[PDB]
């Protein structure tokens, strides 16, 4: 469908997740 | 209070190649879908193609199928459509557009000034 | 593709007149509509969207009206800056934008 919203939903999460891990690399 | 300028138009003849640019103004480019109409001297207004916010889908009329290519590049702040196998019945003055961000409404709001194609010999 | 016809192509009318200007499709477009007017020298503009919306900007004289194939818009008190061609533009799923021929209205 050619008509399909082209464009980036401006509604999605603004934020940072908040359970990225926390952790050192330990590589 | 974001102006799209379209450039890149003059005199061709017809199965050569042609690059027109869309660079737009203060408008939030990578967030918005894009647009060409064209509007022939006539006074015929014909949809031409559609790029999605990245690129990731592109869409184009049944007139232009695998002889116009439309690319995005949301990081110069600009729009390209490059027109392969050109033939007269493309004279037209070219028309940028920018989609309007509602949910199903594909409609246009800020236009640009326009760049004249012309097909001869 | 959907072909898109309005009529009249040509209507003449006088400042403070109340004129329609139509637009037929082909086929059942539910009400994905939009209209637009092209002064002479200029890109068109957005006056109606959703076929009975009104743009922002877009000064309360004009109204949109109709669903399916037979629309319509109404300009309740034509005024001289009024002046322009309008065409109809659909924006169907699953076709292909398409326009119509454009009315042009044309002084006295």
């Known amino acids: 469908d050619p008509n399909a919203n082209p464009n980036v939903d401006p509604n999605a999460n603004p934020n940072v997740d908040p359970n990225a891990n926390p952790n050192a690399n330990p590589n | 209070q974001v102006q799209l300028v379209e450039s890149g138009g003059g005199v061709v003849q017809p199965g050569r190649s042609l690059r027109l640019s869309c660079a737009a103004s203060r408008l939030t480019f990578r967030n918005f879908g894009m647009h060409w109409v064209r509007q022939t001297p006539g006074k015929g207004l014909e949809w031409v193609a559609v790029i999605w916010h990245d690129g990731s889908n592109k869409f184009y009329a049944d007139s232009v199928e695998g002889r116009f290519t439309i690319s995005r590049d949301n990081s110069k702040n600009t729009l390209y459509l490059q027109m392969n196998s050109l033939r007269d019945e493309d004279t037209a003055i070219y028309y940028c557009?920018?989609?309007?961000?509602?949910?199903?409404?594909?409609?246009?709001?800020?236009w640009g000034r326009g760049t004249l194609v012309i097909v001869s010999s | 593709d959907i072909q898109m016809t309005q009529s009249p192509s040509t209507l003449s009318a006088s400042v403070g007149d109340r004129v329609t200007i139509t637009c037929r499709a082909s086929q059942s477009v539910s009400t994905s509509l939009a209209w637009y007017q092209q002064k002479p020298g200029k890109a068109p503009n957005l006056l109606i969207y959703?076929?009975?919306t009104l743009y922002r900007g877009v000064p309360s004289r004009f109204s949109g009206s109709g669903s399916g194939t037979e629309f319509t818009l109404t300009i309740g008190s034509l005024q001289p800056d009024d002046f322009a061609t309008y065409y109809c533009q659909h924006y169907n799923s699953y076709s292909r934008i398409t326009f119509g021929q454009g009315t042009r209205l044309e002084i006295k």
């Open positions: 557009a920018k989609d309007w961000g509602g949910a199903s409404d594909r409609v246009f709001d800020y």
């Open positions: 959703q076929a009975s």
